[PDB]
Design a binder for this molecule. Structure first.
Ligand SMILES: O=C(Cc1ccc(CC(=O)NO)cc1)NO
Ligand SMILES: [Zn+2]
Ligand SMILES: [Zn+2]
Ligand SMILES: [Zn+2]
Ligand SMILES: [Zn+2]
Ligand SMILES: [Zn+2]
Ligand SMILES: [Zn+2]
Ligand SMILES: [Zn+2]
Ligand SMILES: [Zn+2]
Ligand SMILES: [Zn+2]
Ligand SMILES: [Zn+2]
Ligand SMILES: [Zn+2]
Ligand SMILES: [Zn+2]
Lengths: 173, 174, 173, 172
C-alpha cells in the first residue's frame, strides 16, 4: 500500500482509471473531427482549430486525472484508447452534435465519479471533481449547445454558406 | 416636515418623479429579461444579450439619477414594486427590438409629460434636468432601435435565422 | 420541451434558482432604497450612501450570475415582481446596518436551503456553484455587517449623531 | 440701440443688472464669513477656505452675467455692493445656515429672471440661466443642507468639538 494513500477507496481508484481512459478517448474523437475538417473537400479551418484545441484540452483533463491518481497513492492502469465511432463526421453541425453527445457522456461519468466520492466519504476527490471538471463540463455543454442552435438557425447542414459563415464569424475569433 | 432645500418644487412634480423612477427601474427589468432570453442555449445570440444587458444597466443609471434629483430638490423617494416584464420568452431579436422601441416610446412619453408638468408648474430647473439628461437620450435610443428593426426586417428576420445571426455579428457585435 | 444541455438538473433546483434570482433582486432593491435614504439632505451620510449603493450593485451581480447559471444548466428563467423594501425611511445608519444584517441572514438561509436541495438531488455542480460563489461571500458580508453594528453601538449610535458621522468618515470613508 | 441687440427686452436687461449686483453681494457675504472663520478666536481654517472659495465663485457668477449683458447688447449699470448683514457670524453652523438662506434668495431671484425670459420669449436667456445657474444653485442648496444637517447632528453649535471635527473631516 502506498505511503501517501489515505481515505482513497479502491472503487475510487478504479473509477479514476476508467475516467482517465474516457478523457483520452474524447481527446481522440476531437483529433479525428479536427483533421476531418482539415480535408480538402471539407476545408473548415476554424472547425479544425476548434476541435483540435478541444482534443488537447481532453489530453489535459486525462493527465490531470493521472496526477490525481498518483497524488492519492492509487496506481495508474491504462487501457487501449478506442478509435472514434466515425471516420467521416458529415458536417460541422453533425460534428458539434456528436461533441455535445460525447461531452454529456463524459459529464455523466464525472457525476457518477463524484457520487462515488460522496458515498465513500472522499471529500478531497469530490472537491477535485467539483473544482476542475464539473463546471468545465457545464460550460462546454452550453457552448456546444449554442453552436448547434446557431448552425441550425443558420440553415446547416443544408447550407454550406451557413457552415462557412459560422466558421468565419463564430469559430474565427 | 418640509425639506430645508425645497424651493419651487411642486408636490405633483415630486410624485411624477417617483413614478418616473419606478418606470426606469421597470425598463431596466425588461432589458435584463430580454438579455438573458438571448443568453439561452436555444437562442444563443450573445450580442443581443450583451446589448440588452447594457441597456438594462443604463436604465438603472436613469433611475438612480432620478432618485438623486428627487433628493436634490428636497422631495422624498417612495419606491413601488417593480413589475415583472410582460413576456418571459421574447421570440426573436427582431421582436425584442420592436418591444424595446415600444417601451422606449412609453418612457419617452412619460418624460415628455414630466417636462410639460415642470413647465406648467414653472419649474425651469426640472424642465432643464429632463431636457439635458433624458430627452435627447430618448430620441437617440428610439432612433437606434428603429434602425435595428429596419435592418433586421430588410435582412429577412425573423423568418431567416441567418439574418439575426449576421445582424448579431456585424451590427450588435460592437 | 427539454433543453439540449440539461443534464442532472432537477426541476426543484430550477424553481429554487428562480426564487433565488428574485431574492437577490429584492436585496438589490433594498440596498438602493437605503443608499438614497442616506443621500437625503436631512441625513447626509454620503459614505453610508456609497456603501449601500455598492451593496445594491453587488446584489444585482448575484442575480445576474444566478440567471446565467439557470441558462447554463438548461433551466428557464421566470421573473417575478420585485417587491419594494419594507421601509421608506431607514431611521439611522445603525438601523440600516441591522436591517441589512437581517436581510443578509435571510438570503444566506435561502442559499443554504438551495445547497441542501442540490445535495439531496445529487447536483454536485449546483452545490459547488453555491459553495464557491455564494456561501463564503454571505458569511463575509454577515461578519462585516456585524462588525459595523458592533462599532456603531459601541460609539453610541443611533442616539449620538457624532457617532454615526465619525463612523461614516473613519469606517465607511 | 446696440448693433447686436436682438430679442433682448429692457426688462430682461434691468433684471440682469440687478442679478449682477446680487451675485456681487453674495460674494461679499462669503468673503466676510471666510475671514470671520480666519479670526484668532474662531480659528476654523477649513470653514474659512470654504467660504472664500464660495466668494470667488460668486465673483465668477457676476462676471458671467456681465459678459452675458454685453453679449445681448445690454448695458451694464453697477450699483453699490451692500455690506453683509453681520460682522460676527457666531459659529460654523450659523454661517452655513446664513449661506443656505442667501443661496435660496439668489436662487429665487434667478428663477424670477428665468420666468421673465420665458414670458418675454427669450429662449437664449432662459437657456443661459438654465445651463449656467439653476442646477448650480440646486447643488449649492443641497450641499449647504447636508452641512447644516451634519453640524446639527454632531451637536453644533453648542459643541465646539462638533465644529472642529466637521472642519477637519468634511471641509478639510
Ligand atoms: O408659454 C405659455 C403661455 C404664456 C405664458 C405666459 C405669458 C406671459 C403673460 O401672460 N404676461 O402677462 C404668455 C404666454 N405657457 O407655458
Ligand atoms: Zn474532458
Ligand atoms: Zn470535454
Ligand atoms: Zn431610461
Ligand atoms: Zn431607455
Ligand atoms: Zn446577494
Ligand atoms: Zn447580499
Ligand atoms: Zn451527503
Ligand atoms: Zn466544493
Ligand atoms: Zn451665485
Ligand atoms: Zn451662490
Ligand atoms: Zn411656456
Ligand atoms: Zn477623526
Amino acid at each position: 500500500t502506498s505511503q501517501v494513500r489515505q481515505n482513497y477507496h479502491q472503487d475510487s481508484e478504479a473509477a479514476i482509471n476508467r475516467q482517465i481512459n474516457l478523457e483520452l478517448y474524447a481527446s481522440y474523437v476531437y483529433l479525428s473531427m479536427s483533421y476531418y475538417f482539415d480535408r480538402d473537400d471539407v476545408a473548415l479551418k476554424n472547425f479544425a482549430k476548434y476541435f483540435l484545441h478541444q482534443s488537447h484540452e481532453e489530453r489535459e483533463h486525462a493527465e490531470k486525472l493521472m496526477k490525481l491518481q498518483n497524488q492519492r497513492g492509487g496506481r495508474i492502469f491504462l487501457q487501449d484508447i478506442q478509435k472514434p465511432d466515425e471516420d467521416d463526421w458529415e458536417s460541422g453541425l453533425n460534428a458539434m452534435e456528436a461533441a455535445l453527445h460525447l461531452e454529456k457522456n463524459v459529464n455523466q461519468s464525472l457525476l457518477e465519479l463524484h457520487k462515488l466520492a460522496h458515498d465513500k466519504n472522499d471529500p478531497h476527490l469530490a472537491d477535485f471533481i467539483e473544482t476542475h471538471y464539473l463546471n468545465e463540463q457545464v460550460k462546454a455543454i452550453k457552448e456546444l449547445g449554442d453552436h448547434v442552435t446557431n448552425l441550425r438557425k443558420m440553415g446547416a447542414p443544408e447550407s454550406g454558406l451557413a457552415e462557412y459563415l459560422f466558421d468565419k464569424h463564430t469559430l474565427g475569433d
